[PDB]
């Protein structure tokens, strides 16, 4: 009987691996690893990880000007 407020992030291994590096750089990102498709993250960093991840993925996307 114990409750822990947080955000349940559901994603694929590719996104999961990216989140780990973000968690590695910023420890507070991930609170606990639930499963290969479920991660617990701090609510405060949700607005930042989603926005920060966009810049990282921008490199993999070819935008013609």
């Amino acid at each position: 009987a114990r409750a822990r407020k947080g955000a349940l992030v559901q994603c694929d291994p590719s996104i999961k691996a990216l989140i780990l590096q973000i968690d590695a750089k910023m420890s507070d990102i991930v609170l606990e690893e639930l499963d290969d498709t479920h991660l617990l993250v701090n609510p405060s960093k949700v607005e930042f990880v989603k926005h920060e991840l966009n810049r990282l993925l921008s490199k993999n996307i070819y935008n013609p000007m």
């Binding site: 291994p13 590719s14 996104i15 691996a17 290969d36 490199k59 993999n60 996307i61 070819y62």
Partner: protein, 615 residues
């Protein structure tokens, strides 16, 4: 734009609104829309006068995109420079443009056309006895050219190596130069009697390309762009046959040279005696007064060291004054040094043949002053619907890289990162299922892979033949012939070596696993292997082109950037997120974690004469 009220939504547009001008009463008939700022021209393919402008627009405007209904052209200095050559003056362009335009031509557009359309046709370059003379038909030009700081009826000599300098200078100065050869009145150069045999059939587009070149009556040096497999070889063959003078052919391959010669004899009536082949195997040169030499640029652009047999050949090429030079695959002549053959080899006319007139650097524009402007271009989809070329069901398979490999992808450096996601297990399983499914359908499959290590691993794992740089000419030729007519061998594993200029009339399916980063030409060149399929007219036939790319990787950046040219031509890639029936396949490579772990480490680990008896 005077006393025109902007619309409430005009703020969204930025200096591009063209509603200030009014439409003519005959809009229902005129097919052309002209952009007064960007120079883009939108052509109606479903309205009267569409055909009359389809060919004219290509000459004056470079085609950007030509989809089914609405074609998109654009007028530029290079495009106008190509049109101004073939008997076209500024008045003709403006008169035709206004006649076919729903809207009046703006002053700004006119000013741009006036500046560059009057330059062509005042200075001529001629060659005599291997000596280059800058000939002008008026004496006024002497006060201009001779007084130029860079430089140094009247005709004066000029250094052969200095042609590339003056020609570029000629572009900067008002008057550019034109390379016209009056072969009719040229009797000093020996002639060769060769004509196309009766079995030959000139296709309608081939005749149109020739007409644009011989419209005025004097041969013009330039570039011809045709779809891969459309017959760019025959284009060069026709030019040599009609000129009827000494000619030299450069082909950037060894297999191509062998097949170029075989097709050369088949289509024309040239006797084998007068035809000579200059490749690594044999280097003998024809002793006849007039003959043809088919070689590769690497065999003529070398400067430091050459063989004794090749040393005489180099002098043999340089000493004689050739009449025509055919630059096969002219997309590589503006490279570092292959352009030397154009200068060292003396020729009164130069021609360029390439399907893709694009490259990463800006040297593509150098072709304008190297061999001339672009003469004719042909659509891809238009020939597809006419039965000239086969239809392709282009596809792009997104294979999500496995988690174990993806972890190393993040940490690994860029140089080693490429090999990691090219050998992911998912690609192996997808390829196996597709190969078995397509093999059951009686289709010939070609698997391209720029990485030699991946090619060998895939080939040995699947027990199929593979060809790459180390493969000798003899062995590969046997493999190619076997793959064409042998039913047992239905698939092969080619590499960057076979990316272009190899004739595969039987190939129908094409797959690629690796790539040479963002090049947009290799994608088109590779696709050309299946565009010349023999059974391209049977009802319902559609070729296949599969691109295996790892998802959530840099491959998408290169994949979306390396297929932009084909999209412009008309090909459309279809995303395949799922391959149905993959699970039901009996066995798949690296299906268990144990094999994946073993592969992970394997790829990761990749980075006194009497004393003579003594020994």
């Amino acid at each position: 734009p005077a006393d025109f009220v902007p619309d409430s939504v005009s703020g969204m547009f930025r200096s591009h609104d063209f509603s200030y001008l009014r439409l003519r009463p005959d809009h229902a008939s005129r097919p052309l829309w002209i952009s007064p700022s960007d120079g883009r021209i939108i052509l109606e393919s479903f309205s009267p006068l569409a055909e009359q402008a389809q060919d004219f627009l290509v000459t004056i405007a470079e085609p950007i995109s030509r989809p089914s209904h609405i074609h998109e052209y654009k007028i530029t200095a290079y495009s106008l420079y190509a049109a101004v050559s073939v008997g076209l003056e500024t008045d003709d362009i403006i008169s035709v443009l206004d006649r076919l335009s729903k809207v009046p031509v703006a002053e700004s557009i006119i000013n741009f056309i006036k500046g560059a359309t009057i330059s062509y046709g005042k200075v001529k370059l001629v060659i005599k006895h291997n000596r280059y003379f800058v000939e002008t038909t008026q004496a006024d030009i002497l006060q201009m050219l001779l007084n130029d700081s860079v430089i140094g009826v009247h005709s004066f000599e000029i250094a052969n190596e200095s042609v590339e300098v003056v020609k570029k200078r000629c572009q900067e100065i008002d008057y550019p130069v034109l390379e016209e050869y009056d072969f009719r009145n040229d009797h000093r150069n020996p002639d060769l009697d060769i004509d196309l045999k009766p079995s030959t059939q000139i296709r309608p587009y081939q005749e149109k390309s020739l007409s644009k070149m011989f419209g005025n009556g004097r041969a013009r040096s330039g570039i011809i762009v045709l779809p891969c497999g459309a017959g760019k070889t025959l284009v060069g063959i026709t030019a040599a046959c009609t000129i009827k003078k000494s000619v030299i052919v450069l082909c950037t391959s060894s297999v191509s040279v062998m097949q170029w010669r075989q097709q050369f004899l088949q289509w024309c009536t040239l006797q084998p005696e007068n035809c000579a082949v200059f490749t690594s195997d044999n280097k003998e040169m024809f002793q006849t007064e007039s003959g043809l030499v088919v070689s590769t640029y690497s065999m003529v652009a070398n400067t430091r060291n050459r063989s004794h047999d090749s040393q005489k050949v180099m002098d043999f090429l340089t000493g004689r004054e050739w009449g025509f030079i055919i630059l096969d695959e002219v997309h590589v002549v503006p490279a570092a040094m292959f352009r030397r053959v154009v200068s060292t080899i003396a020729a009164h006319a130069k021609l360029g043949l390439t399907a893709t007139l694009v490259r990463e650097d800006d040297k593509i524009g150098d072709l304008n002053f190297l061999i001339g402007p672009k003469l004719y271009e042909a659509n891809w989809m238009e020939l597809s619907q006419k039965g000239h070329i086969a239809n392709v069901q282009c596809a792009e398979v997104w294979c999500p890289m496995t988690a174990e490999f993806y972890q190393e992808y993040l940490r690994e450096t860029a140089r080693k990162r490429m090999l990691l996601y090219i050998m992911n297990p998912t690609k192996f399983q997808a390829c196996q299922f597709l190969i078995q499914y397509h093999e059951r359908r009686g289709d010939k499959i070609i698997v391209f892979s720029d990485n030699v290590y991946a090619l060998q691993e895939y080939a040995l794992k699947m027990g199929k033949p593979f060809i790459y740089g180390s493969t000798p000419q003899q062995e590969r030729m046997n493999i190619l012939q076997n793959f064409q007519y042998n039913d047992q061998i239905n698939t092969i594993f080619l590499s960057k070596v076979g990316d272009t200029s190899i004739d595969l009339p039987e190939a129908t399916c094409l797959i690629q696993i690796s790539s040479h980063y963002g090049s947009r030409r290799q994608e088109a060149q590779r696709l050309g292997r299946i565009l010349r399929a023999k059974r391209r007219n049977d009802e319902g036939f559609n070729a296949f082109f599969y691109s295996l790319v790892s998802k959530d990787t840099q491959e998408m950046y290169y994949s979306t950037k390396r297929q932009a040219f084909l999209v412009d031509q008309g090909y459309a890639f279809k995303v395949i997120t799922h391959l149905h029936g993959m699970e039901n396949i009996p066995n798949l490579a690296y299906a268990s974690p144990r094999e994946r772990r073993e592969l992970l480490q394997e790829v990761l680990l990749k980075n006194h004469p009497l004393i003579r008896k003594m020994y």
